[model samples]
Target: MTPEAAYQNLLEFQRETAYLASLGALAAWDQRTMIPKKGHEHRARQMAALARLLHQRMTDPRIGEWLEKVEGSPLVQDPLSDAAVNVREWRQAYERARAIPERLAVELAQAESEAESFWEEARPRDDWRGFLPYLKRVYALTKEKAEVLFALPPAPGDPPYGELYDALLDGYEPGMRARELLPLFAELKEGLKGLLDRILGSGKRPDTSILHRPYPVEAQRRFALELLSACGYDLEAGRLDPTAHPFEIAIGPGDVRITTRYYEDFFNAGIFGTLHEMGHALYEQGLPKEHWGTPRGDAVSLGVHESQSRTWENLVGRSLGFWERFFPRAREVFASLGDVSLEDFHFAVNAVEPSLIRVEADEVTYNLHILVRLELELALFRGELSPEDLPEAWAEKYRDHLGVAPKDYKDGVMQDVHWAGGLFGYFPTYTLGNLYAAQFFQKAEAELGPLEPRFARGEFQPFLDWTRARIHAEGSRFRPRVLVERVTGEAPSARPFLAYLEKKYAALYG
Candidate 1:
């Protein structure tokens, strides 16, 4: 086949596969939001069947021949060109998928589906014993898959388990590894704890009680939709729903969905959570439409994706100016917040405190939560820690890192749905996002002059347009590290994040 013919054939394969996976995305979304309790059994079967089909198609030999024919073509001479990026990603994905046995692929999918159901029940009941066996199954299958993946050629100088962990990490954040992440985490851990110490030393405390008053769920829902629309989220292309754990799904271009949970007595969960998911949805909606189903149409990495969410949630959503624009509307929407002043509410939203749950953690303590999990997962992957001892290890890490421990497993090891859903090597991206968010925000200020003024006037399109051009438009044309450095003129570091926190919190608590 000619190179042009091969390229067209490859594009057709990718588009068809994307369409199939979009169906799976829809099923998973329904399972979380609208499916009945008794529907999990059949849902697991359906998910596994889809997994089997996708794997079968990915490992087909004809695609391998097409990749070999097109890799050296003139169309791939430009590294950042669409054809080049798509072919590179297609090869990497095929190699990874071909290494795993088809049976293991289907089993992992089925196991993850069952584990999700188990967690839904176990978390509310605080029943770790009932959930432990399924979690063990997940870990075992994941380890087996990692073993098969590690058999591939490792990056030079990688140690034994480093190969295993990096292989898993590459799927989430391509080209990221454990070796570099260790030192970065160390820097963040020290910087975050130092900030935490100074905040504790300053005897002033913000009154967060105003946030815990009685607020109606319907009012909160209406308020969330308003904020989403204000931030330029296209309601015609995306919609929000309720779920136990808030998340965003990109079924395809012009079809993004997000979910958030409500607390009648606490309003921050649904409000900030919507903003967080809005960041994700906006990125999904911002990708180059013509490149849909190709690598250049997808996110660069989970870290980069999280940067968008963190930017909107903390940099903009929790800003003083954001409240200035919306505080009046907020009072009209929920009477409980009417008596609260804008300044006090701003402090309440940005409150810095150590908490039992990672999702609810303050900005200063949030990375510490991620650091603990990064270490725990590394140990688990290395066989130094077993699944049974995870609870105790989790509690100990909490005490050592954040100086707080959970009293029960529900709020402890069982809190997150990531591991139960087989998302390893994913925790570190949360902190990575924070680092990149600050770095990107600093660049935005220099390029766009001042954001607070724009936010105050409810003119957020400039900031949205900035990110859409600098980050979202490029898509996966560059690796995560390369993309950050290209945009910010430096590699990812803790300085920007530390400076932002020190400058902001010092004024608040100092």
Candidate 2:
């Protein structure tokens, strides 16, 4: 009874913290989408106050007392129980939170908000010089926070000697180390670069003019709505808005929301971006609502989260089988595509162009683009690169990886909103998502047998259900690497992603 009482105390405190955190997510989303321009300065202080108060609750001394009473108790005897998962993650969270002083925590939130808001102005104007100060401020604060977190005692099975970058990386992808990723990405980079040359070497590029043709905004919106609905996203539980960059956020259960970016000419941008963000919404909505206030209800990691996005975006949205079913529907919506053959339209959507924008890169070259960012981030954290020299460095990495460089800052260093949001370790998860998605899909095909045919028949829920059982429903029951292995019966590797790319591009190009 004593242990159970303490456990309840812990859970209640966590629930209270979650309520505040959910509000934080809402305000951040509003800042991005709906807040007035002048409201930002005042919003920054409000965000800081909220963040500061949240930090106090998170680092409360009572949490340690609750854990001490509850540890090694009968209630958590089953390691996989929800109580166990929550207690395990909460202790880690409390420790990390306590390491961050209230001043740094508040300042970080304030700086992050300011940097992100300034980024909106700077990106379109190609003003890298103007944005550099905000970026530097965020970087310094983030670095300080990372070092503080890194100094803490390792959680069980954590990397004992991971550096500042790994400290930040763990915040997003727990249990991942820069050490493991180096070899994994090295192998992936070699395979992708080789495949890129092979595809271009084959001299069989898809005619992508169809994609660049006028795709009306209203028509695109209608199609995006239908696309998400068919993919099993609950429109009642979710809403979509347009933003400069596409993203998905779960305000809480039954309120998952996503934003997308659309274009007047490019069909690829809006449709696939919605598909990507909806995949995220599905996973968020798919989380076990019974555990909403705890880690057990949260996503396992950004890696797994991005895998869901890629699962829908690249695997489903860009699949030939997906188009085989959806193309007729699309043609019905857009008379411009009425004359386009299914095969040509499919090929065009999967075009393999080495491009400037990461969002616009071909599926085959996308991981290569990720390597460029990942390497640059490592350089910055290791003190091998400076914010001042980032512009030239960005161009050089782009050229080295993709054989193309942005002609302007808007298309180059100023493009992504991640850094402005203080997301340094976030880029690598995009590559990890590709790896995990391929492995999961391969396993599903082996187990479920030939998904494309079912997709060709417009049956998506079978695959969705498969992931729901294996990935979504499991939630944070397992660590990411463990989760991937448990789901696929194979360790996370570049081989599956490499194989998928080779087989895909060969069928299209060879």
Candidate 3:
């Protein structure tokens, strides 16, 4: 086949792959959100079988030859636009699939699936012992995968375990690394530490119990849908459902699903959670259409992906302009909160209270929560802490790092399902996302100036368009580091994030 023909053929293969992958994504969403407790075992087998099929498709050697041919083709002059990005992205996924043996990938998947079920039972009982074996299996498997994927000799610094961290990161972000992230985290930690000191040191505290009052689940759901619609989320392409944890998944080209959890006492949590997930959904919905199955058709990076979610959730949804526009709509849905003023409600939503759960954490305390998880997970890989002792280690970290202790398993070690299910390299992305969001926001402000006014006027199109043109549409064409530098014209800086926190919180506290 000619290079152009091979390229087109690869594209067709990608389309079918994306469709099959979507079916798997849908099954996961259904299992978590709608399936009965007894249905998990069946769902697990179905998911495993689907995953095995996807892995086999990926390991097909024909794609490699097509990729080489496409790279040298005279069929396209500007390779960077469509063909280059598609071929490059397809090649990267191909390399990752080839690097790890298929048996290992299947083993990892099976372990994670069983671990999740074990976690669900152990967490409620607070049985650390019952949870330990699963965690050990998870840790051993993750370490094994990391070791092989990096192809590093097993030794200090040479171990390339850290490089494996970046490799997994690259799975979500085409090119992101520890070297780029360290300085960003350092700057964020320093500036945030000072800002956190100020916020916590200040005696100013709002009665968050206001949220703990009776909030009808239906009302919260309706309010969530309205907020999502206002944010320009295409409901025809996406749907919302309730889950234990909030998330968004896009199964295929024309379909997306989002999940939110509601507490009878907390209305804003679920509402904001839905908006956050919808922000992610919007990015998925906005991916380059013609390149749907390839890298260019996917999100830029995890950090970049988080920026979309956080920007919409924190910068736009929780911003002064957002509240001004949506407060009345919220009041209409929440009759129990009829007496709540917009100012008070806004303050409540943005309240900087530090707590145990990362999802429910306030904006100022959010990044710190990520740091805590990052440290603990790294320690687990290093053999510093046994997963059996995870609860004690988790509690100690909370007491030592965050200055609070959880009253129960639901609020503490059992709160997050990340570790139990083996997401070792995943924690840092949350904070990395904050840094990227701030950097992008800084660029947005420099280019577009005041955001609140535009927000109040419901003029987000320019801002959205700017991000898409500069960052989103570029896809895996640029590494996250290069992507940020190109858009912001500066190395990614934590100063922007620090400045944002101090300013927002200082004003709020006063």
Report per-prediction Cα RMSD to one decimal. Answer: 2.7, 2.5, 3.7
Cα lDDT of model 1 by residue, 283-395, tens digit: 99999989888899999899999999999899999988898999999999888987788888888888999999997788888999999999999999988999999999999
Better of 1 and 2 by lDDT: 1
- Model 3, backbone clash pairs (residues 3+ apart or across chains), number: 1
lDDT of 2 by residue, 190-285 (tens): 898888888878878688999888889989999999889888999999899988778898999899999998899989889999999998999998
How well does candidate 3 score on lDDT at residue 225? 81
Q: Candidate 2 has what TM-score?
A: 0.92
How many clashes (backbone N, Cα, C below 3 Å) per candidate?
0, 0, 1
Which stretches of model 2 miss by more than 4 angstroms? 27-49, 110-134, 241-244
Best by lDDT: 1
Total clashes, candidate 2?
A: 0
Candidate 2 yields a Cα-based lDDT of 0.88
